[PDB]
Amino acid sequence: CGVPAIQPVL
Amino acid sequence: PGAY
Amino acid sequence: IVNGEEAVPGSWPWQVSLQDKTGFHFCGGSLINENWVVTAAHCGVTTSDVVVAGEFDQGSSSEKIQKLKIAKVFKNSKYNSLTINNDITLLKLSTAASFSQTVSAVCLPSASDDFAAGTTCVTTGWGLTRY
């Protein structure tokens, strides 16, 4: 859980 | 709130 | 979100959209596993409402989104409508969500976890951008 396949870009 |  | 920015599509896989039968987005939520989404008690979700997963643009008709039905609503027995305290409600899905690159679960903290003031975290949603 908590680790997207498409990482966030902040 | 604000709603009752 | 006021002063937020657009997210990368599919980068917040657990973010779901609670919509009424009209198709109107009224509240957000988070998938905690293939059969359960967590939201706010004050959203007043009923079983005729729908949970949309894998969605980024509410205006797009070409996204492969998942429209999941709600089996039962579980309102935290400690919820206080007068103070809006313990504002949490669980949704058991009749149809199980299918996890993919764009649909998955957020982790839950242990009752013991501490998150220090000053820590920079993140919040997402389709709420108004300006009042």
Binding site: - | - | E5, N33, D87, D113, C121, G125, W126, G127, L128, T129
Partner: protein, 95 residues
């Protein structure tokens, strides 16, 4: 209301500091964040306030309430998940 999913990062505050803006409405199962130039607003309710712990995004709060005009100068108020996680575990474990 945006068609595309929005995001924003914001600092967490202590309840005692938050009580300066909100007073006695800030209960223990609540956690504030914001007053940083960004603000959750209407329609965001129920959504996540995630913090990254050990590489993974962990659900820390759920958008509940805050300023009526979504003032980026005042902190929003989220349900504190640590104070609620035991109820979630119990509920999942029995259904």
């Amino acid at each position: 209301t945006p068609d595309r999913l929005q995001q924003a990062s914001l600092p967490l505050l202590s309840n005692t500091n938050c009580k300066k803006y909100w007073g006695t409405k800030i209960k223990d199962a609540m956690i504030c964040a914001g007053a940083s130039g960004v603000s959750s607003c209407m329609g965001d309710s129920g959504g996540p306030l995630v913090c990254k712990k050990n590489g993974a995004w962990t659900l820390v709060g759920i958008v509940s309430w805050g300023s009526s005009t979504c003032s980026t100068s005042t902190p929003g108020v989220y349900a504190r998940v640590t104070a609620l996680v035991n109820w979630v575990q119990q509920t999942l474990a029995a259904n």
